[PDB]
């Protein structure tokens, strides 16, 4: 690492005295993905406001949507906050208060990402329980969902604090030297994604039965799945086809860029699909506007 270089550099004087294009594309991705992140923070906050203070829309479904939306800001804000810090050698060319700050900002982001990913699972589980499960009247699981929504990522990230600090502590929790430590945080993300894929398949199986019973059809199925994919965050499962291959070349950057693309604009897409397209809230604003006029 860089820090080891100056350590051996100074000790030499004690005895005496007795890679360009890849940076540019990453920078071009850095502006691109922070554009989607910043926009998603602005647009969904409008969506969250017009959907939280309205007492008309307060069903249990919208509570998860409220909590799913606020996990996108908290994920997007953390990324912007961590990227703002970015203690890069270039900012300078002894330093303090940043290496520890980068530790705090990064550890917030790790929980923030885990909170967003596990909340997509909660929405998938609730929707699965709303159709497949029979007899359960719901409304009593919201205590568990809140615990799973925000308490589950704690079990994913609290050990990550301990096991990395005592084994492979780095400068500010940004360098990933060993892939073994990259798990504990990555594996639960994959586990939540894989479970959502099974739930997404089950709902598509049920929705196929609903479309076939009452008979155009090809268009309805196509719109529904693309209406459902961002809700459960299931598009990410096909951008992770066993990373043990690790193809080399511009394809890796292109694949990563598209994977970065969807993550950056996920918040804006989810905000507009379930706050604007949704006819109930869209038509409800007409009723509220009628009283004002």
């Amino acid at each position: 690492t860089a820090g080891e270089l100056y350590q051996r550099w100074e000790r030499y004087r004690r005895e005496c005295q007795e890679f360009l294009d890849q940076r540019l594309i990453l920078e071009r991705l850095q502006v691109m993905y922070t554009v989607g992140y910043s926009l998603s923070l602005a647009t969904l906050l409008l969506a969250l406001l017009i959907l939280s203070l309205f007492r008309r829309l307060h069903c249990t479904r919208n509570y998860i949507h409220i909590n799913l939306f606020t996990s996108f800001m908290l994920r997007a804000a953390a990324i912007l906050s961590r990227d703002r810090l970015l203690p890069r050698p270039g900012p300078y060319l002894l330093w303090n208060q940043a290496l520890a700050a980068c530790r705090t900002a990064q550890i917030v982001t790790q929980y923030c990402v885990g909170a967003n990913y596990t909340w997509l699972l909660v929405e998938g589980v609730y929707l699965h329980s709303l159709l497949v499960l029979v007899g359960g009247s719901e409304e009593g699981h919201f205590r568990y969902y809140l615990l799973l929504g925000w308490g589950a990522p704690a079990l994913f990230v609290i050990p990550w604090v301990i096991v990395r600090y005592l084994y492979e502590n780095t400068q500010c929790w940004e360098r990933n030297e060993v892939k073994a430590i990259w798990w504990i945080i990555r594996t639960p993300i994959l586990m939540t994604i894989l479970i959502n894929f099974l739930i997404f398949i089950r709902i598509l199986g049920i929705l196929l039965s609903k479309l076939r019973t009452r008979q155009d059809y090809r268009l309805r199925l196509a719109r529904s799945t693309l209406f459902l994919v961002p809700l459960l965050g299931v598009h990410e499962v096909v951008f992770a086809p066993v990373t043990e291959e690790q193809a080399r070349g511009a394809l890796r950057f292109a694949k990563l860029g598209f994977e970065i693309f969807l993550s950056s604009f996920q918040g804006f897409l989810v905000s507009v699909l379930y706050c604007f397209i949704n006819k109930e809230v869209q038509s409800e604003i007409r009723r509220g506007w009628h009283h004002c006029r």
Partner: peptide
Amino acid sequence: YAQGTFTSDYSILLDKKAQAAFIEYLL
């Protein structure tokens, strides 16, 4: 987890450029 890999690649890719420049700056 797109975010983590991008900042991990960016962590070294900029660090290595500082190295090969620090030595050249001396001469």
